[PDB]
């Protein structure tokens, strides 16, 4: 370009140096490392239900052949129990405020 190319180089070098300092400054480097591994664990080892069962059926745990139905039962029971608790709370509130209405 022109004489401003020196300013361009200075600015880009300053940005590079700041990035380098921030990345591998001991505490920041350690916390970025731990954050990267935590992100890997979260994304790749999420609580799935479908997975490759390479082991023979004589080796697969019964905890794995029934985990789907355990999860479905727990979620459905939680939902129906929440609905029942909402109905019970509604009737309880109505009865209580009818008793205290007088």
């Amino acid at each position: 370009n022109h004489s401003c190319q020196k300013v361009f180089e200075g600015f880009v070098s300053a940005l590079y140096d700041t990035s380098y300092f921030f990345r591998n400054f001991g505490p920041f480097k350690a916390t970025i490392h731990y954050a990267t591994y935590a992100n890997y664990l979260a994304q790749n080892w999420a609580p799935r239900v479908s997975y490759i069962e390479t082991s023979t059926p004589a080796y697969t745990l019964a905890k794995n052949k029934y985990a789907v139905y355990i999860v479905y039962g727990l979620i459905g029971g939680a939902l129906i129990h929440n609905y029942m608790l909402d109905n019970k709370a509604a009737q309880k509130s109505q009865q209580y405020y009818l008793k205290h209405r007088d």
Partner: protein
């Protein structure tokens, strides 16, 4: 030998449908445009 392949398919389809339902609001329209072309009661 994927376990619960049907469940995985159903879960992915349900997630996609729910996301498209909430992100686009396709099933929850606004009928203010249709209000002028309507006959009122009372």
């Amino acid at each position: 030998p994927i376990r619960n392949i049907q469940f995985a398919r159903y879960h992915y389809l349900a997630a996609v449908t729910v996301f498209t339902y909430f992100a686009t609001r396709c099933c929850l329209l606004d009928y203010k445009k249709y209000y002028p072309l309507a006959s009122v009661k009372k």
